[PDB]
Structure formats: C-alpha cells, structure tokens
Amino acid sequence: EVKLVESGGGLVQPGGSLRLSCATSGFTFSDFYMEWVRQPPGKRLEWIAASRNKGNKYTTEYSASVKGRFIVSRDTSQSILYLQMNALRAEDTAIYYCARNYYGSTWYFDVWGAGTTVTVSSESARNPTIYPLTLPPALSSDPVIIGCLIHDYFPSGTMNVTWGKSGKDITTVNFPPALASGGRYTMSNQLTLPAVECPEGESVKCSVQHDSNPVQELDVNC
Amino acid sequence: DIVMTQSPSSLSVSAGERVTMSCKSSQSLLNSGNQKNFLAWYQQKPGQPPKLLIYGASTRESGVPDRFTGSGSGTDFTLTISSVQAEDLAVYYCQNDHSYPLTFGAGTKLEIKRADAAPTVSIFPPSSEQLTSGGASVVCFLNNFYPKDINVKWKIDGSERQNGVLNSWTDQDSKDSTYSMSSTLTLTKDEYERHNSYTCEATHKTSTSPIVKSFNRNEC
Numbered sequence A: 001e002v003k004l005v006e007s008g009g010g011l012v013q014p015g016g017s018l019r020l021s022c023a024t025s026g027f028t029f030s031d032f033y034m035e036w037v038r039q040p041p042g043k044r045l046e047w048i049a050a051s052r053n054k055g056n057k058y059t060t061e062y063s064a065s066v067k068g069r070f071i072v073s074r075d076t077s078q079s080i081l082y083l084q085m086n087a088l089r090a091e092d093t094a095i096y097y098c099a100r101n102y103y104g105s106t107w108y109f110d111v112w113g114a115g116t117t118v119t120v121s122s123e124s125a126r127n128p129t130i131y132p133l134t135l136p137p138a139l140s141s142d143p144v145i146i147g148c149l150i151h152d153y154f155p156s157g158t159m160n161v162t163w164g165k166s167g168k169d170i171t172t173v174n175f176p177p178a179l180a181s182g183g184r185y186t187m188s189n190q191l192t193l194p195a196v197e198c199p200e201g202e203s204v205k206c207s208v209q210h211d212s213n214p215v216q217e218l219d220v221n222c
Numbered sequence B: 001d002i003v004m005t006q007s008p009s010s011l012s013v014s015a016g017e018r019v020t021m022s023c024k025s026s027q028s029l030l031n032s033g034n035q036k037n038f039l040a041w042y043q044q045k046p047g048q049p050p051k052l053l054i055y056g057a058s059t060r061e062s063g064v065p066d067r068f069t070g071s072g073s074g075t076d077f078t079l080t081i082s083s084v085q086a087e088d089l090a091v092y093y094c095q096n097d098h099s100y101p102l103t104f105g106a107g108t109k110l111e112i113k114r115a116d117a118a119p120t121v122s123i124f125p126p127s128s129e130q131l132t133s134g135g136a137s138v139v140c141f142l143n144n145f146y147p148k149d150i151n152v153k154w155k156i157d158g159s160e161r162q163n164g165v166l167n168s169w170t171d172q173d174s175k176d177s178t179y180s181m182s183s184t185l186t187l188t189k190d191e192y193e194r195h196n197s198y199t200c201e202a203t204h205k206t207s208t209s210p211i212v213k214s215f216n217r218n219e220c
C-alpha cells in the first residue's frame, strides 16, 4: 500500500514555471528521503532534487543541471512532495518521477511513481482529432481489425489508449507518435478481436488520455 | 560525481539463454564501515516506470524471479539473467545509491532473437469524417514480423512513393518478441480524390514477393 502519485505536467513555454507534486500514501512520509528523477526522451534516468526525513532537517540537494532553478518542498500535513520548476528550457523536457530512497542495510529506491510528462515548448497545445479506422465488409477477414487514428496533436507527452473490450482474443497495438508535417504528432491504435465480438452496428469505443487532460473517446463500428 | 559504466549497451539473446550485463563505477560503492555496496539494479520495461531489481549488490527484491542474480563489490558489478524469457525485454539500469548526486548508467537494452515470422498486412481507407476536412489518411498496419527490418512502399495509384508517408515500429512484443509497424500516407482530399487504386506492399526477408495489401476506390 506504499503508493506515490505525481501530478501537474504538460505544455510550458520557455521561461514558464511549473509545480509538479508527489502524493505519497501508505507510509510515514514524515521520515523517508524523497527523491526527484527525470527521464529525457532517449536518455538515462537523471537524478535532480532530494528531500530528507524529518530526522535531520528536511534538507535538500539539487543536481548541478538544476541547482538554482528548481526548488523542492514538502507539505508535511498533507504528505505531498513538491517540485518548483523555475525558468524552464527545452532540455527540461522529460517524464518526472518521485521516488522513495529507502534505507535498511543499504539505500535503494523501493517505490517509484508512474511519472508525469513535462514538455517545455514554444509551440502550442492541439488536442488530437479522433477518426475511426474501419473496413467496408469487403476487406474484413475475421478477426476484425479496427482502430483509432489519433491525429494532429501537440504535445506528444503521454498518450494512454484503451478500448471498451478485453478478454482472451482481443489484441491492442498502440504505435508511438510520429512527427508529421506541421511539426505536430500522429498516432494510431488498432484493436483486433473475434468477428463475433464485433458483429454489426455494434462498435467499440477507444479512449484517449493525453498528458494531464480529460479523456477523449470515439465509437468505432466493427 | 561518480560515473556508472554499463556494458554491453545492447544484448540480443534467443531466450532460454543465460546472460550477464556488467556495471562498474568510478568510485567504490562499498561501505568501509558496514561493508555493503550502495548499488541498485533497476528493470525498466517499455513505457513503465523503473522497478527495483537488486539492492545491496546481490539482494534480489521479493517477487523477482530467481532467474535474476547479482554479484560484485567495489567497482565492478554484474547482473546475470539465468534463462532469458520474452518478458525480460527491458532496460537494466544500475545506480550509485552511494552519494549525491545519485547517478545511473546508460542501461542495457535486452533484445530477444526468435525465428523469422511473417507480417500480416492491412490497408484502411481514409475516413469520411476526416475527408471533410481537406485531409485523407490511408493507413497500413503490418503486424507480427521478425526481424524488424521491413521496407514498405506506397505506390499511390500507378506507381508512386514519397515524403508524404509516416512510419512507426512498435516495441518488441513481450510475448512473441515480434514487431508491428504502421505506415501512414496522408495526402489531401483533392489530391487523394485524383487517383483511386491505393496500395501497400512490404518487402520482408521472410517472403521473396513483396507482400501487397491494396484497395481501389475514391470516387465514392
């Protein structure tokens, strides 16, 4: 029941600021070293800030890469770990993770967050536009193939796609985003399932969850 | 700073195999007082947060299969996977939990080798809903092939090909260690509406004959 859930992240203009937060539950927050880790697009984990247990003054430490612009705090009453991000630049774009630096015999990170994406960009948000991916009953071989073309959106950040169908035969394929022409992304998500699990005038809804924004869903006909 | 050097940076095993990744530090990680090294091994599966793998240099975290084992002390550590399996597909990071700033290594991508598999191809015509916007996107999906190297040609109508095509490889499947790819050719409603026989043909080591899913229509 040791859970860490971070939030607040997305599009931010260079010079902008953000306040990422880490909601820590199922343990005595007030006495575990908390840690902030980031992961740039095609790079290693990178350690940034560090908070300390109410054992030796909630002292901090910051990576050189961030010493000065980021500032780490903790709302002890509410068990939340904060990260104040000042004067962001594009190099700051990465998935942010909050971790618990446990110490028993040794030190190691026992529990990690899910992460939260932060895109520091000059560009501007554009929600995907969901188009159904269907075959006129002259191309469907059974199993049926269906999908969702998630198109022309910004930023890329994080896109979780789920369908209103699951079980034995039912496959989901989510292709990574592709930078098109406009410098905007496109992605596709196909669902394959038993032809009898996708008769007619039925449909399956696909759900798009992008960064920190509300859900977007389309109804796709078998 | 303390540097974490991990090698190889890539590993391609056939599975059922036994492997060993290494990880040396520029500085002793071992306590000179409690005598334990402060080095952890993390496993990072495709689009998932890291997960505790090994603590101390050899303590396997509760839940981790007995296939994962770790040795060393001082500055040169190892990690061996006794019998590589299809879900082992991930990145292995070793970290210095010795002193600040904490550091990680480049990691090691573990890739699974398998017997060549043939791609299933699909062609989806542009949506009505989308047409009525200027655009037209003909998407072709290629699923479950091996190896990944697979060229796809988009001969619009007569014969063509172009810079109006997007391509995306899926990650290696954690069940079949097979790939999937989508190729999206997106033109204009007008543009689209000129020709009418749209084709997709992949050229995979598998078969000799370029595999060609196709479709003709546009008038309608």
Ligand SMILES: C[N+](C)(C)CCOP(=O)(O)O
Residues within 6 Å of the ligand: A033, A101, A107, B097, B098, B099, B100, B102
């Ligand atoms: C916890 N730690 C291993 C990252 C550092 C230990 O010493 P300190 O954190 O008190 O400086």
